Paper text:
Dipeptidyl peptidase-4 (DPP-4), the serine protease responsible for metabolism of the incretin hormones glucagon-like peptide-1 and glucose-dependent insulinotropic polypeptide, plays an important role in regulating glucose homeostasis. Thus, DPP-4 is an attractive target for therapeutic intervention, and inhibitors of DPP-4 have been shown to be an effective therapy for treatment of T2DM. Trelagliptin (SYR-472, zafatek) is a novel once-weekly DPP-4 inhibitor approved in Japan.
The 2-position carbonyl participates in an important hydrogen bond with the backbone NH of Tyr631, and the uracil ring π-stacks with Tyr547. The single chemical structural difference between the two compounds is the presence of a fluorine atom at the 5-position of the cyanobenzyl group. Examination of the environment around the fluorine atom in the DPP-4 active site reveals the proximity of residues Trp659, Tyr631, and Val656. Of these residues, only hydrogen atoms are within Van der Waals distance of the fluorine. Fluorine carries a permanent partial negative change and so these atoms would be expected to produce an additional attractive force between ligand and protein, compared to a hydrogen atom at the 5-position.
Author numbering:
A (entry chain B): 34 to 766
B (entry chain A): 40 to 72, 75 to 766
Write the structure that this text describes.
């Protein structure tokens, strides 16, 4: 006699086998009024206006193909489809693949002059059907899909010269992309970066492969660790309309400002402003100074001129420039003006309006909140996401501001579904006539389509009723999102609370940590994850805290750990734990901490702190000392590890130096052997230091797994392993 | 009141005293304290060098070495370990008759091997893979070889696989008995593939180093070998030394082969043994110096073949010959018709040898040979394969055999080794168990005891206070055949009680884990403090009991020796004092393989286990060892069984057990690879297990801190498996 009360919980197997599936609604805008979507592997076009859809491409159209198709891309003009197959993953964004082009009009595979195997990147021009691709680190252009390619670059060289694609650090830390090609708006020009890794040292590590491989392979990747020789970069623009089968193409170089050339620098943003005007942002290796150049094509010479009178400097006295890099400009149609996110006088990030000829910009938004991103710009309105609503830095809503009157700001998303929806992202149609809103929480995700004309809702695309239906009699956890005041400053936390949460009781507490610069772990997003299991099934509170160095609340918080990683952010997690115990529903003897990546570092620094607050913790793929990690991320926050810069704090902020203090705690250290990002080295050095002072700890290596430890089997194994460790640390049967 | 603790084991609270002498003549020996010479006669000892004669040397002296004539001492410093035996060092020579360091024409830094000639004070050494000879310590050295090249050509020193698996040594230099000739081998690793692994080094090193070592895994291209002899009495300052090659016999040059033994017979006769890559066929060459030629000749009529139809040849390699004084006769250990290893007497000029020992037991080694007597160690006494005693056989009558050690102290002493003086007039006996080690000195003329050198009374006194475990050594019968086991039994062993049991396994070919040796080790702690029985069992494949048992796993690694550890454990649970809910198993090296194969067997006998630096599949291990037992991993040889004998293939069965897998990341021997493939296989079938890597540790995991950490980590694991707080 169970009286239909909820007795199921969200189990580990539920998490690992995806029993409860979040439904997405992924679409790709092709025009201002149409998008594509998949239904049972068929590709449908949907017309946003009248809600209808015709099948665009049958699920069976490439049955005969003979290869499994990984992805596709349709040309802007709708006449060709690019089919990607033989996908082989490289780093976070990079991969190689084979490509075939299918003619949608003639309904046939192009068979002549095919894109080669092992292609590294492919991109349609933004209009028409020109193709640029990179193969063997060289850029090629096809003006028509069945015609011979024009080789643009001849300097490409494996691990040394990269044309049109990024090297390792630029991929992971600057562009968040493999691609380093930018077509001009109408496809006349093709801009590209060339990276030179010639004297960049190699990280070398073993890759064991299938058990058939008799001798392990040594992988060798150019990787600048902090203070090491960095890649250099050059920027070019080629006119694709004046290509020629008989003469090699002329790439016009756009050189960095002298203020950048006097030392090590980076190329940190590329943005076309018009058909004949491109903006570049460069960044000094000491990343507190950046320069935007605005460069016009000179018709009579066929070269590019960046007028000093249109240079813009963005700098910071309290930290680095930008959240992770200088923000990108959104240009007006005429290219004489642009909008960009920068920190205001009070350290808050807001949209500034620039004319290209003027040094002073004027802020169009302000307040003790921040603009997350500029999402679209029309002639009358600018659309942006911000955390203004209710002063909740972990919320996200879409707003629009009238360009002619800045006091006219409308929230488009705030009141749509206030209880269910407080974390929005947006996808606008090609000229902003429609937009898809994606609400990610705190309720179940919700995908809606809107006409921007008068912001009326057209329809619900996906409302996750199937999941809602399944969860009716499952004892799910809740999320408390709130703040504590420390030194007259709000710091936000979230708690994943077990079902039937009773403040009278004392719960074990797991502190789930990132805490890196501009991190945010206290937000309104709904998640089905390991923490859901721990709270639901194992009755553990899983909490996260955004202390100093956290993002989206201004520079006085975010920049507080400048040049001082492994200090305040570490201390604030410990303090968070003390505060959580102060709240009266936490068992002080069963507080644990875990993190991945920066969170691994913090977890480790906390467990080695001697605080006595934490019984145990898990560090997954942690940084152990900053000199081991890449230059652009590390130096952003730490400067250079030289006696004249910041070597002392590099040396003071290691987990190894704290080995002795791990005698007080139970520690599990986990690392993938093929981690190209945070090298296995980092954990190898932790383990060696703990061994050297005689502290027992648990370890797990993951053969051939990288930073994501994301293989289906490894992912299940690591979470199972961590679950056993936590349960035993907390004496849960 | 107290027990033998883990800290006791880890910190060496209770030390075993050795007595390590080094003979200088037929009646004198050195010993450390200070360095005394001792008389074998009287035991009177005048000092040779004061504890700090080298007070103002400045360098920490690793080891010393006196020239045979006593005129010079060689000081070794700046020791840096390479592999198991190999190392690099700096060297200085001190004139004893003048009392001063030689300062001219010194031995280079990073010298790889140095050796005195067997008489006088000639010196040969290896530096940058080339051989140099010094006639006098202060004079310039003559360069013998010019082909030495790092990782590629090795003159007078072994490459990785020859060091580890053939010679158990770095040196490949062999002086003739009076020092006239210097014989040397030359190895060529040119097409041997490289094992590559990361070395993380000190925290200060920003980018890991990639260590690369030529290492032939099973079936890979092997090193090639050449053998040379040079006359050191006709070296020139003007002309280059002329090294005479001795080529391997035509029966070996037909394919891949190995040089497996070098034994000088006389001043002008050298014996070489060669082994085919398929190691069931070896040939001994006897080569004589020709004065008018200046050449060495090995008559095909003097070739002696040793082969096996049931396995490989030798225990780990063909045995060494012991030539009579005139060098026309020799004695060596070979398998007889019944498959037992016994001493055969060969005449240089003929095919048939005659066995001078016989029976169902084995000769372990020929220890010394005189005109009247051959001295040897065997396990004959009481039919106990795990005992060892010294015997002498009257050369004029083989039926006259005296056991010299059996009856000296039968209770305390059943495991002897021996060190004879230069002409076998005196000998030191070393008893290693079952009681406390006992070192005694004896005169061979009448095999009388002279004196106790070390009796470990100091250790005996300390142990009085400690609840020490006992050893049971006994056998069981499987298929009308005896298989021996030993058990470390906790103190106050109550056979009406049910004890947890840990099976300690090696179980490799020619292994022996059941013996009469006394040990203070991890098992002592587990027995004394944790009341765990620690058992070992010598099944099929095990050694010193004849070929029928040893060759039983020929071409079939990971079969019978694995089943027999399982069957042993079953038998132990039927002994009534074993808790069958708490049986574990662990092992290192081959024992990690077997442990892993056992735990993946699905037998249900074992709750848990620990594999340390295990082999996971035979293609990952070196060619010399692996192929000895497995042949080649090719379709026409033994590929199928290479494929059938992996621990990865048993991954699914690890669901029934708790496994701890441990490996050093700089293991040059069993590559970290092997455990990496185990862990991946267990991950891929969703088996949870425990792991531990040891950063920059090698196959020994022998760094002081790492040693303590692994045993501590393992102890927690077994205690938790056994529900011991
Ligand atoms: C990439 O950068 C390297 C420098 O790291 C350039 O190599 C130098 O080239 C100049 C002129 O040819 C020489 O004087 C230097 O000696 C070179 N230095 C080296 C090889 O370390 C190289 O030219 C660059 N390559 C490209 C294609 O831009
Ligand atoms: C072996 O190396 C040592 C140390 O590097 C040598 O001694 C050094 O010799 C240099 C001259 O080359 C002097 O400047 C140093 O003062 C010496 N250092 C020390 C610590 O002694 C030594 O001479 C080298 N070679 C031999 C044959 O001994
Ligand atoms: C060591 O072995 C290598 C590999 O067999 C020998 O190298 C060959 O030498 C011959 C004649 O000099 C060349 O024609 C081949 O091309 C070489 N092969 C290589 C390098 O792979 C080498 O001669 C041997 N060295 C010694 C000292 O015995
Ligand atoms: C002893 O032999 C060596 C090695 O062949 C000779 O040294 C080489 O001589 C050749 C040319 O004659 C050079 O190309 C080599 O580079 C030399 N050195 C080495 C280390 O290979 C040496 O000349 C010979 N000595 C005498 C006295 O004949
Ligand atoms: C937890 N977490 C993330 O989810 C994403 C991260 N970065 C942010 C900067 C841009 C990308 N490189 C992704 N980082 C930063 C980081 C810090 C380290 F110390 C070591 C490794 C990473 C990494 N991937 C994180 O920590
Ligand atoms: C337990 N144990 C030993 O104590 C000594 C061993 N060898 C015997 C042959 C000569 C030397 N290589 C020492 N072996 C053999 C072995 C087998 C493996 F499968 C993997 C690795 C080793 C190794 N060192 C052992 O197993
Ligand atoms: C939607 O409806 C209109 C009818 O006016 C039609 O012309 C258009 O092609 C339709 N699009 C579809 C079904 O995708
Ligand atoms: C790519 O791969 C396969 C061969 O493995 C072949 O069928 C195809 O023609 C290759 N080359 C190109 C240019 O596609
Ligand atoms: C283009 O450049 C390459 C290399 O610089 C050269 O070999 C090739 O001949 C050139 N082609 C033309 C048409 O100039
Ligand atoms: C693209 O832009 C360029 C530069 O303004 C211009 O010359 C060209 O006419 C444009 N092409 C098309 C097809 O609109
Ligand atoms: C940039 O950083 C360096 C080192 O921290 C500092 O000396 C310099 O003044 C900074 N620049 C600005 C504009 O704050
Ligand atoms: C021991 O005594 C003898 C007796 O004369 C003496 O000749 C010898 O040198 C001594 N040996 C040692 C090592 O003291
Ligand atoms: C050493 O043996 C060699 C070769 O037999 C011989 O020529 C030489 O005379 C011997 N030397 C001495 C001093 O015995
Ligand atoms: C050596 O081994 C091979 C392969 O097992 C076998 O065929 C051959 O007969 C053996 N040789 C001898 C002499 O037994």
């Amino acid at each position: 006699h169970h009286h239909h009360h909820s007795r199921k919980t969200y189990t580990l197997t539920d998490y690992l086998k995806n029993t409860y599936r979040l439904k997405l609604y992924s679409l790709r805008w092709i025009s201002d009024h149409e998008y594509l979507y998949k239904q049972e592997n068929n590709i449908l076009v949907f017309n946003a206006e009248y809600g209808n859809s015709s099948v665009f491409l049958e699920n069976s159209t490439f049955d005969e193909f003979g290869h499994s198709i990984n992805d596709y891309s349709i040309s802007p003009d709708g006449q060709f489809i690019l089919l990607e197959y033989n996908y082989v993953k490289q780093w976070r964004h990079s991969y190689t693949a084979s490509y075939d082009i299918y003619d949608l009009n003639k309904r046939q595979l192009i068979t002549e002059e095919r894109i080669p195997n092992n292609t590294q990147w492919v991109t349609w021009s933004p209009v028409g059907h020109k193709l640029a691709y990179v193969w063997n680190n060289d850029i090629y252009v096809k003006i028509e899909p069945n015609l011979p390619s024009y080789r643009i670059t001849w300097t490409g060289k494996e691990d040394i010269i990269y044309n049109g694609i990024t090297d390792w650090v630029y991929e992971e830390e600057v562009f968040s992309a493999y691609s380093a090609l930018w077509w001009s708006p109408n496809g006349t020009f093709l801009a590209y970066a060339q990276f030179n890794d010639t004297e960049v040292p190699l990280i070398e590590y073993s890759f064991y492969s299938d058990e058939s491989l008799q001798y392990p392979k040594t992988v060798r990747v150019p990787y600048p660790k902090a203070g090491a020789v960095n890649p250099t970069v050059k920027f070019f623009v080629v006119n694709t309309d004046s290509l020629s089968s008989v003469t090699n193409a002329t790439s016009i170089q756009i050189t960095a400002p002298a203020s950048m050339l006097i030392g090590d620098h980076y190329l940190c943003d590329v943005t076309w402003a018009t058909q004949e005007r491109i903006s570049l942002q460069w960044l000094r290796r000491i990343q507190n100074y950046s320069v935007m150049d605005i460069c016009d094509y000179d018709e009579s010479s066929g070269r590019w001129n960046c007028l000093v009178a249109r240079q813009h400097i963005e700098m910071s006295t309290t930290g680095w420039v930008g959240r992770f890099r200088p923000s990108e400009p959104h240009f007006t149609l005429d290219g004489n003006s642009f909008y960009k996110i920068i920190s205001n006088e009070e350290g808050y990030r807001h949209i500034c309006y620039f004319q290209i000829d003027k040094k002073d910009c004027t802020f169009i938004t302000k307040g003790t909140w921040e603009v997350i991103g500029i999402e679209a710009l029309t002639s009358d309105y600018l659309y942006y996401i911000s955390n203004e609503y209710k002063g909740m830095p972990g919320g996200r809503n879409l707003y629009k501001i009238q360009l002619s009157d800045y006091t006219k700001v409308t929230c488009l998303s705030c009141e749509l579904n206030p209880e269910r929806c407080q974390y929005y992202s947006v996808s606008f149609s090609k000229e902003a006539k429609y937009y898809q809103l994606r609400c990610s929480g705190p309720g179940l995700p919700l995908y809606t389509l809107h006409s921007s004309v008068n912001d009326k809702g057209l329809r619900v695309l996906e409302d996750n009723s199937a999941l809602d239906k399944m969860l009716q009699n499952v004892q799910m956890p809740s999320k408390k999102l709130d703040f504590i005041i420390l030194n007259e400053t709000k710091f936000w936390y979230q708690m994943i609370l077990p079902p039937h949460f009773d403040k009278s009781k004392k719960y074990p507490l797991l502190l789930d940590v990132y805490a890196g610069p501009c991190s945010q772990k206290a937000d309104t997003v709904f998640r089905l994850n390991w923490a859901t299991y721990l709270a639901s099934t194992e009755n553990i509170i899983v909490a996260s805290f955004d202390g100093r160095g956290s993002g989206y609340q201004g520079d006085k918080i975010m920049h507080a750990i400048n040049r001082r990683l492994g200090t305040f952010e570490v201390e604030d997690q410990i303090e968070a734990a003390r505060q959580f115990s102060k709240m009266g529903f936490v068992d002080n003897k069963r507080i644990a901490i875990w993190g991945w990546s920066y969170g691994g570092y913090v977890t480790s620094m906390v467990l080695g702190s001697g605080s006595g607050v934490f019984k145990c913790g898990i560090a997954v793929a942690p940084v152990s000392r900053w000199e081991y990690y890449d230059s652009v991320y590390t130096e952003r926050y730490m400067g250079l590890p030289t006696p004249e810069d910041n070597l002392d704090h590099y040396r003071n902020s290691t987990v190894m130096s704290r080995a002795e203090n791990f005698k007080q705690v139970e520690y599990l250290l986990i690392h993938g052997t093929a981690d190209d990002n945070v090298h296995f080295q980092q954990s190898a050095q932790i383990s060696k230091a703990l061994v050297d002072v005689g502290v027992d700890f648990q370890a797990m290596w993951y053969t051939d797994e990288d930073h994501g430890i994301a293989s289906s089997t490894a992912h299940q194994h690591i979470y199972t392993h961590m679950s056993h460790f936590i349960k035993q640390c907390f004496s849960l049967p």
